[PDB]
Design a protein around this ligand. Sequence first.
Ligand SMILES: Nc1ncnc2c1ncn2[C@@H]1O[C@H](COP(=O)(O)OP(=O)(O)OP(=O)(O)O)[C@@H](O)[C@H]1O
Ligand SMILES: Nc1ncnc2c1ncn2[C@@H]1O[C@H](COP(=O)(O)OP(=O)(O)OP(=O)(O)O)[C@@H](O)[C@H]1O
Ligand SMILES: [Mg+2]
Ligand SMILES: [Mg+2]
Ligand code: NA
Lengths: 171, 171
Amino acid sequence: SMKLTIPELSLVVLIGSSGSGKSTFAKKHFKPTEVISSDFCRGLMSDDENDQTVTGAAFDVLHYIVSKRLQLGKLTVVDATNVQESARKPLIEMAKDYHCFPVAVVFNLPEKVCQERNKNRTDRQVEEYVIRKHTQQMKKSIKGLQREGFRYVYILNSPEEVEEVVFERQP
Amino acid sequence: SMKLTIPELSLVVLIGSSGSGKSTFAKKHFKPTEVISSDFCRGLMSDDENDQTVTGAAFDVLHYIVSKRLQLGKLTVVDATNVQESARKPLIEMAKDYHCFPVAVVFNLPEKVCQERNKNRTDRQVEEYVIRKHTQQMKKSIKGLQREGFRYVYILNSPEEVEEVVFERQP
Ligand SMILES: Nc1ncnc2c1ncn2[C@@H]1O[C@H](COP(=O)(O)OP(=O)(O)OP(=O)(O)O)[C@@H](O)[C@H]1O
Ligand SMILES: Nc1ncnc2c1ncn2[C@@H]1O[C@H](COP(=O)(O)OP(=O)(O)OP(=O)(O)O)[C@@H](O)[C@H]1O
Ligand SMILES: [Mg+2]
Ligand SMILES: [Mg+2]
Ligand code: NA
């Protein structure tokens, strides 16, 4: 296995393109209540699946819910693309505010893996350029993650590595 | 039938004891995505139903989600007991803030009806003293509701009146 050590007081930030398997991974490794997704928050604002008109509100709600959980000192996983620095920074800042350790888990999968999984999705699908963009943005992000303030940076480079993952929580 | 008017843009505040049928009424009359409940928000903070350290943050989460919806111009129902003035105050403020109409719907049922439904619930139950206190709080709230800032105050005085309610979203 590939052991990823995280402290009990963690803000786990999943980073990866659409189709990179973030939500799948999240369900495999964490309790439902520990996972907060952007899709979920969007759904609180609108019953249209992936309503793009409520994006800012959805991310405000996500930030709010995360901050409240961290405030109670509860481990939280942020399930969103998080490929932009502007999306990661408030998570880092929030984590630092409430004495929690930000952890980055990067799905550094080749674009074609994500493009493939996308086309076979039964829930929702995006155009190819969305995934091409996300992947470029993710790849550009990797080098500077530690410096951005992530205490632990775990880069998963292939599906096989993603499969082998096991978290060890240290309380 | 008892026709109650609610503007398209309303904050609908359900007021009643545990066991008074708030959630059942909400499901009958409104879309699932229109209804934000305290149980749901509590669930976002913890998977332990009996955890009380959570309630302040769940309160804060309920208000925030509701306020973002109101900001987006979306009719929202607050499915919580709302029998304390302190609980209602921030709801009124947000409705004013985002120019929504605050509407109170009060489940003015006898304590016995709520106790007996509580005993027969298979989903989750509260202790009888909780219902006694809610009902007293609800009764004490009625006279002041219009003065609190509710623009429409609808008091349902019996199960038969609750059953006959039909909402008209005219304005
Ligand atoms: N390890 C895997 N191997 C093969 N297919 C997978 C794997 N993980 C996920 N998939 C499939 O790929 C699709 C996308 O996965 P998932 O929804 O978890 O992506 P995501 O990163 O959450 O995307 P989004 O950012 O759009 O929410 C799903 O249909 C899923 O079943
Ligand atoms: N009109 C009704 N006649 C008979 N039983 C009812 C009626 N409305 C609701 N009930 C029953 O009473 C129980 C409690 O109802 P419900 O959960 O809607 O109450 P609530 O006010 O949402 O309670 P809480 O505040 O604890 O969430 C449920 O088992 C429900 O099926
Ligand atoms: Mg997902
Ligand atoms: Mg209820
Ligand atoms: Na009104």
